[PDB]
Structures are given as C-alpha cells and as structure tokens.
Amino acid sequence: TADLMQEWGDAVQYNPAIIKVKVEPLYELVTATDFAYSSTVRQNMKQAL
Amino acid sequence: SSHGCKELENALKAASGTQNNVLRGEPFIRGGGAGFISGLSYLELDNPA
C-alpha cells in the first residue's frame, strides 16, 4: 500500500542505508601527524592490501 | 444382385491466440519529505497521477 511506502520512507530518514559510496583505502589515514614511519606503514598496507 | 457403398469424412479444426500486455512507469521526485516522496512516487496503477 502507498501508505506503507510512505511510512517506510518516513522511517528511512532515521535509519537509512548507504546507497552510494565513494571510498578511499584505509592507508590514506596513516599520516605522519599520528604515526612514526608513516611512509613505511603506508607502503606495507599497500602491499598487504 | 450385388451392391457396394463407400463413405468417407474428414474434418479439421485449428485455432490459436496470443496476448502481449506490457505496462511500465517511472515516477520521479526531487525535494520534500522522504515519506511523501516514497508515498507519492509509488505508482498507484489505478491513478498514475
């Protein structure tokens, strides 16, 4: 029923799924600001990944 | 005295029929409340408006 589709779409505001995603690989978080040997860890992550 | 009769009948019926019935629709909305969007975009086939 159109009513239940309305109710579903109302409730999606509060608990949505992720339809589209644009992602970066996690090594891009490895940053010298946080970690010694950042480059080395980064490269290791590339290889491991 | 002698008598002969031969009788022959052949009858043929062939019938055929087909239906193709295709229905398509794509209501599209931008803006407004997500529940109103989903409720209205849902295609009431009896009232496509």
Curated annotation (Swiss-Prot), chain A:
It comes from the Eukaryota. It is found in: Secreted; Target cell membrane. Coiled coil: none annotated. N-glycosylated; contains one or two bound glycans. Not O-glycosylated. Heterotrimer of 3 chains: alpha (C8A), beta (C8B) and gamma (C8G); the alpha and gamma chains are disulfide bonded. Component of the membrane attack complex (MAC), composed of complement C5b, C6, C7, C8A, C8B, C8G and multiple copies of the pore-forming subunit C9. It is linked to Complement component 8 deficiency, 2: A rare defect of the complement classical pathway associated with susceptibility to severe recurrent infections, predominantly by Neisseria gonorrhoeae or Neisseria meningitidis. Belongs to the complement C6/C7/C8/C9 family. Component of the membrane attack complex (MAC), a multiprotein complex activated by the complement cascade, which inserts into a target cell membrane and forms a pore, leading to target cell membrane rupture and cell lysis. The MAC is initiated by proteolytic cleavage of C5 into complement C5b in response to the classical, alternative, lectin and GZMK complement pathways. The complement pathways consist in a cascade of proteins that leads to phagocytosis and breakdown of pathogens and signaling that strengthens the adaptive immune system. This is Complement component C8 beta chain.
UniProtKB/Swiss-Prot annotation, chain B:
Coiled coil: none annotated. C-, N- and O-glycosylated. O-glycosylated with core 1 or possibly core 8 glycans. It is found in: Secreted; Target cell membrane. Component of the membrane attack complex (MAC), a multiprotein complex activated by the complement cascade, which inserts into a target cell membrane and forms a pore, leading to target cell membrane rupture and cell lysis. The MAC is initiated by proteolytic cleavage of C5 into complement C5b in response to the classical, alternative, lectin and GZMK complement pathways. The complement pathways consist in a cascade of proteins that leads to phagocytosis and breakdown of pathogens and signaling that strengthens the adaptive immune system. C7 serves as a membrane anchor. Monomer or dimer; as a C5b-7 complex it can also form multimeric rosettes. Component of the membrane attack complex (MAC), composed of complement C5b, C6, C7, C8A, C8B, C8G and multiple copies of the pore-forming subunit C9. Belongs to the complement C6/C7/C8/C9 family. It is linked to Complement component 7 deficiency: A rare defect of the complement classical pathway associated with susceptibility to severe recurrent infections, predominantly by Neisseria gonorrhoeae or Neisseria meningitidis. This is Complement component C7. It comes from Homo sapiens (Human). The chain holds residues 349 to 397 of 843 of the full protein.
